[PDB]
Amino acid sequence: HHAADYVLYKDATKPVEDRVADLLGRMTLAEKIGQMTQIERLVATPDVLRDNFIGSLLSGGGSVPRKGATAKEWQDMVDGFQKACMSTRLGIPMIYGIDAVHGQNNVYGATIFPHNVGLGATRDPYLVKRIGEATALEVRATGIQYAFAPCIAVCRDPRWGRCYESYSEDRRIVQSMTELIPGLQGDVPKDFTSGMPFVAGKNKVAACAKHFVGDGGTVDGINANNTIINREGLMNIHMPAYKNAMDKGVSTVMISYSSWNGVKMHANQDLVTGYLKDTLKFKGFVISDWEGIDRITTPAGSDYSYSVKASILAGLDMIMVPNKYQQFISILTGHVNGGVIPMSRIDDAVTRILRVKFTMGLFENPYADPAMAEQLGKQEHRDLAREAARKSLVLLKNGKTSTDAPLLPLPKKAPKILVAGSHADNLGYQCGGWTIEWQGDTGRTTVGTTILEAVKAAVDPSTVVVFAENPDAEFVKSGGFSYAIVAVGEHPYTETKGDNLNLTIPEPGLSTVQAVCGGVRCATVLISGRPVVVQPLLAASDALVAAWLPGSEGQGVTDALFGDFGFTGRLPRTWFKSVDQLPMNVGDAHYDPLFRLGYGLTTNAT
Ligand SMILES: *[C@@H]1O[C@H](CO)[C@@H](O)[C@H](O)[C@H]1NC(C)=O
Questions:
Q1: Where is the Glycoside hydrolase family 3 C-terminal domain (predicted)?
Q2: Cα of 585 to ligand 1 centre, how many Å?
Q3: Cα–Cα nearest to 421, from 476, 458, 459
Q4: Can you state the percent helix, strand and coil of the chain, rounding each to 5?
Q5: Angle formed by the axes of helices 325-337 and 304-314, to 10°?
């Protein structure tokens, strides 16, 4: 179809499958294995990208061009690495991936939405769609084309450090919230074949259903450990949302570090090829986790030869190396040259990678759009995050006795009020993990509104607002306060750092609630990624709200505290009485919750 130097794969009017086959038929083994290789930006250079024909780059948590970088700085970084890849013989663009899991959360000034546990509490899949929509725009603001989300783990034990990354312990809720996928990617057309990848174009991103499969079912909630459950229970609890993800055209699937009955996911051919690919008919690309193939062995990295063979034969297509690319490429090349990995396996992997790249429009728009930079932290998106935060809140108590006046909603007009606690004025704590840094961080880490800021923004001008982080009992008694709002809870964490067998919040937390509530009628705002030991907090408090990890828009919290909207959130997880009960789900036998799944009190707007 026309000039003498025509190349079919470069013709945007041709069918994706024809473009994929055309390009594939031209590629050398080095060019094929290059597509299968994803490296960290920290090891990337123009020569490295060109000389090893690299297929993909990522930023891990905290991997940023610099602290405070603008959207434009991100675009220019991404474009520099793209220019190198486009300069190879075949000019195959790279795809850049990142953990944009509650907004474009590594980026300064990005809107930070509630983490998944709170979204589960909203029971609003359209809200979650809109969050996917907004997140795609903020990811494209930075020139990035690929988000490692959604996490569709079904967390069955809250001692897991990733429980906040699960929408719920109930798979039906997780299933409903796969609407994040068409938000991030665009809706699939009416004719669509389940399992095909889809991304609408340059204003959308490729998505990633993760981590396949049973990541939320591990023993004692130990992150990346073994999930012991029969096939029936794997398929009834952990798998279903993957089929909803196929039906919505999820582009990619990331494999879990976890094992299923002692078999590493990253080596599990029956599940990755037999089930995901051959039974679900998945046609996008399967990606490893970060040194996931290394960790097939114990110790990790003790037979990288075997890791490469096991993973690739199992059916993984792209490998998140992410640093030792030369070793990865060399070992895989050697296995193919030795006949240990057939060319049919390499060609399948490359076909899937190229199918996602052509489908999403990456060969037509390999570079960033500078007009999209201004999408970052946009007010419309902050309004959406505020709505989500407010909708996520679960009211657990609202009066000590059944005869007390309901504390919430609080009046905006009062002579003097107290805001107190470690989490009342700490933006980093209210965002939790995967925010700026991998593990999150403390204090004013990005643009947002703390709970204290939000109070000051909500109250009548005649209300005096006093902040004290950890006031003693006498301070409160002597202060002439109408009421207090006290915010306490967990510190930020991510992955194995968040694994916690006691689930008791750090001090001073309880002690400040006790001091404050001892003095004046109090509304306690509990910031956590999960249920935590709550009976002592409840005993002290007039009202108590489970606000989860509500993100940058702290006005969502005060929207409900002051009655602009009613409380509507409901527990998306069981609240336990004691950690000795765990695991405890919601049709066991020892099922004896403090608050059952679905519990939540309501108020009416004032
Ligand atoms: C689970 O963690 C335990 C305790 O650290 C360790 O013995 C074991 O290797 C882990 N198992 C798996 C499958 O990761």
A1: 393-602
A2: 23
A3: 476
A4: 40, 15, 50
A5: 70
Catalytic (active-site) positions = 289, 495
With respect to residue 182, please indicate whether it lies within any of the assigned structural domains.
Answer: yes
Location of structure tokens 């919290």: 557
Structural domain ending residue among the three candidates 347, 367, 387? 367
Q: Are residues 273 and 310 both part of a single domain? A: no
Residue 587 lies in a domain: no
Q: Which ligand 1 atom is nearest residue 259's CA?
A: 13
93 and 149 housed in the same domain: no
| Residues whose beta carbon lies within 6 Å of some atom of ligand 1 | 222, 225-226, 259
Is 415 in the same domain as 561? yes
C-alpha 227 – ligand 1 centre gap (Å): 11
Closest residue CA from atom 6 of ligand 1: 225
The residue nearest atom 2 of ligand 1, judged by CA position, is 225
The atom number, within ligand 1, closest to the CA of 262 reads 13
> Alpha helix (H) ranges present in 141-256?
171-176, 180-185, 231-233, 240-247
Nearest ligand 1 atom to alpha carbon 264? 13
| Token couple for 1 | 């179809």
Structure tokens at 23: 């390009």
Give the end of a domain, one of 222, 254, 282: 282
Measured in angstroms, the resolution is 1.8
How remote is the CA of residue 219 from the centroid of ligand 1, in Å? 9
Does 606 fall in a domain?
no
What total number of domains does the chain contain? 3
- Token digits for 317? 């297509």
Distance separating alpha carbons of residues 443 and 485, to the nearest angstrom: 19
Pairing of strands 259-260, 263-264: antiparallel
Q: Which stretches within 14-70 are classed as H helix?
A: 16-24, 29-35, 46-51
Alpha helices in 270-423 (DSSP H): 304-314, 325-337, 343-359, 379-392
426/572 same-domain check: yes
Nearest CA to ligand 1 atom 14: 225
Please give the distance, rounded to the nearest whole angstrom, from the Cα atom of residue 225 to the centre of ligand 1: 5
Domain range spanning residue 439?
379-581
